Enzyme design. Structure first.
Site, PDB file in Angstrom:
ATOM      1  N   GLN B 202     -56.627   4.242 -17.321  1.00 39.27           N
ATOM      2  CA  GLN B 202     -57.984   4.716 -17.070  1.00 39.27           C
ATOM      3  C   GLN B 202     -58.365   5.961 -17.874  1.00 39.27           C
ATOM      4  O   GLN B 202     -59.542   6.309 -17.978  1.00 39.27           O
ATOM      5  CB  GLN B 202     -58.155   5.026 -15.581  1.00 39.27           C
ATOM      6  CG  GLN B 202     -59.559   5.465 -15.197  1.00 39.27           C
ATOM      7  CD  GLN B 202     -60.541   4.312 -15.187  1.00 39.27           C
ATOM      8  OE1 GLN B 202     -61.741   4.498 -15.411  1.00 39.27           O
ATOM      9  NE2 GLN B 202     -60.036   3.107 -14.914  1.00 39.27           N
ATOM     10  N   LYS B 225     -59.137  -2.666 -21.524  1.00 36.78           N
ATOM     11  CA  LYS B 225     -60.011  -1.681 -20.888  1.00 36.78           C
ATOM     12  C   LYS B 225     -60.490  -0.654 -21.908  1.00 36.78           C
ATOM     13  O   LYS B 225     -61.354   0.168 -21.609  1.00 36.78           O
ATOM     14  CB  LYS B 225     -59.303  -0.966 -19.729  1.00 36.78           C
ATOM     15  CG  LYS B 225     -59.307  -1.752 -18.421  1.00 36.78           C
ATOM     16  CD  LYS B 225     -58.677  -0.983 -17.262  1.00 36.78           C
ATOM     17  CE  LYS B 225     -59.506   0.234 -16.889  1.00 36.78           C
ATOM     18  NZ  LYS B 225     -58.941   0.980 -15.727  1.00 36.78           N
TER      19      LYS B 225
END
Lengths: 405, 405
Positions: B202, B225
């Site tokens: 993240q 991501k």
């Protein structure tokens, strides 16, 4: 009803040039080229409907989740598995065998047991097993080879005993092109209560495969060699067996519930063996490949190839000092050496002529050692290959002979 | 010098419609969309220069092999690793942690030792460890949480003892948006001779990351991501440590030599940990993503995002009964619930409005249990998101309130 012209038309890579000459890609056995239907199939997904799978509340997410499962289902049909839930997605054959070697191996092979492998096995169906034996304390047995590149089946009786847990065989060799008598072997392995894992990374694209008909307990193949994308493979496991297998990789998606105090419980197969975000794009591409090959029909392809092979072989007779390895009834690949010239140089001259071929041990050292050869050449014949390309090889091969003497 | 207009222009998926309305993709935290530069980067490779890597004798093969390694090198620069040989290619963060949990874990954690993880960890940085402890016989310790979504650091002294082998922490939470004080924590963990593994799946796309500056021993992130392709991730391991680690997966490419009688010897890191045919196409695509993000500059992106976040938060104040979870200084994601309405329904109405959001436990049950909530909503803010989309969310959120009462 097969037309090399119509087919080669779908592979853009084939109209390329190398060293100023037209590319004659004869290394599909290392990895096959992809048709624009497969390439765009993935690209479009990324452009118009990309989202995280795992069944989400939103639309794209739920749609991607469905597309993913349709591919799993379609693939179950391709190898004719009994149900789509008998197929696990993996990176490729290598990962597939490692999953079995661990999940199933660590819990079924006790010290004192033996595993049988052939001597023609690719390193991916060797090392994973040597490792299992190392830690579990089991014995590894090898089926010897005959000079013509075939298994010495007469030795089977003295390898298969009561303590034989598993038999890991290759459906079709990636060097010799040999296709083993799986059916028969599986039967015999079962009468001893041993399980069988077939490595069909080389079989899946040369002719139909029916995992039910074979009755193998494990089957694996890689998508990148089946005219599909890289990073996606298929591991088939008999439902009866899969349900009993414990997880290998751990993470999200493969759990039912995670509790730091209560412990963690797993979900059910196959999802139990699919931890983390999938290779959604590779899967989509795999579906495209699967559908494309089915459109031509494995039997039609199997025919055009077997034909091009007979041509290739007879033609290679006009090459002096050429030494072939393997059976006359070979499938897909041609292993050879030119006189006493290192394969590295033979392949080097061939590349200069705009011809792609592999040279080395082909991730099969045990097999090279059987022939006292340090390495050999390997020309592969696929559906998009033509007669002219075969001649190009033969000719340049004779040239290399007249030049290096 | 950032322009959402110029950026959104590269993502074709954004000009799509859902339920007849313009798509407002606020779930980049589950998986980011890809720009056409990344999509074509891979497609072109498949169309013009596809071949098997593994350094072959022929041209395309040797060229692909080089492109692959250039990506590895470029990625080493991105996280600022000391050398490209400190980076291992994996499917994603999940596989990365599993590799460490096995290769390094099984040989460094003896029964009686303890591993420390936070209570906000994603399931991928929990299960792999619970498993290690299960077989090795080690203890698992958790850093509690504070109501505002921050680690209760005061408890550190009573968790870190002499027998603490490893500390597995998340750089930035995928639900709360919390960014932990890695630097400091790493120091303290090192003074006890414990190693640290940071889960930056993240973090990597919200601002620069310097693995040298942090001095973490392990770092992992997933490409899907990071505006890149699926099925490709990066595992960074300190050279000093990597060299000592034993192989996890076995097969071709990761061996030096295979002998059925002499045994098998491994190659050297990182290739030792890269068995079988790579995800060449995913790697190529990862390179494109890496280069694209660098072109905009993580600092410029970090700014436009932090700005859009402040806007989003203040705006969400006008929504009655809205309950947020996490710190005020949150990064990338927004976790919330509407009154007493199940997140599943709140997200369901939002989808109908053409808004993408995740609802569920976000593969972080331990964290949900901390709040006595069965699940929550999670809107993600990425570089391609705009103010208008934020309003669209706020508005529809108030609508859902006035409707369901």
């Amino acid at each position: 009803i097969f037309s090399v012209d119509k087919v080669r038309a779908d592979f853009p890579v084939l109209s390329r040039e190398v060293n100023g000459l037209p590319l004659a890609y004869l290394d599909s056995a290392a990895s096959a080229q992809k048709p624009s239907q497969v390439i765009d199939a993935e690209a479009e997904f990324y452009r118009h409907g990309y989202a995280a799978v795992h069944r989400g509340i939103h639309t794209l997410s739920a749609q991607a989740t469905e597309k993913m499962e349709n591919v799993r289902k379609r693939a179950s049909l391709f190898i004719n598995a009994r149900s789509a839930e008998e197929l696990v997605f993996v990176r490729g054959t290598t990962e597939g065998i490692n999953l079995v070697a661990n999940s199933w191996g660590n819990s079924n092979v006790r010290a004192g047991d033996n595993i049988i492998i052939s001597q023609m096995e690719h390193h991916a169906n060797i090392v994973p097993w040597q490792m299992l034996c190392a830690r579990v304390g089991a014995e590894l047995r090898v089926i010897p080879l005959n000079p013509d590149g075939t298994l010495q089946l007469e030795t089977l009786p003295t390898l298969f005993d009561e303590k034989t847990r598993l038999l890991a065989i290759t459906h079709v060799s990636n060097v010799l092109g040999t296709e083993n008598p799986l059916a028969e072997m599986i039967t015999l392995a079962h009468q001893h209560g041993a399980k069988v894992l077939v490595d069909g990374a080389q079989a899946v694209m040369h002719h139909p495969v029916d995992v039910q008909a074979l009755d193998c307990d494990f089957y694996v193949f890689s998508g990148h060699k089946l005219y599909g994308p890289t990073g996606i493979g298929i591991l088939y496991v008999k439902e009866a067996l899969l349900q009993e297998m414990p997880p290998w990789e751990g993470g999200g998606s493969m759990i039912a519930t995670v509790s730091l105090s209560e412990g963690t419980t797993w979900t059910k197969a196959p999802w139990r063996f699919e931890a983390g975000t999938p290779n959604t794009g590779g899967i989509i591409g795999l579906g495209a490949a699967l559908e494309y090959v089915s459109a031509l029909g494995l039997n039609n392809i199997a025919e055009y190839e077997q034909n091009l092979m007979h041509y290739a072989l007879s033609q290679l007779e006009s090459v002096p000092d050429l030494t072939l390895y393997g059976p006359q009834n070979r499938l897909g690949v041609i292993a050879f050496n030119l006189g006493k010239h290192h394969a590295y140089d033979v392949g080097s001259f061939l590349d200069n002529y705009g011809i792609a071929v592999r040279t080395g041990h082909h991730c099969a050292m045990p097999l090279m050692a059987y022939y006292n050869v340090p390495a050999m050449c390997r020309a592969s014949l696929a559906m998009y290959n033509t007669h002219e390309e075969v001649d190009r090889l033969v000719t340049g091969l004779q040239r290399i002979h007249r030049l290096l003497g």
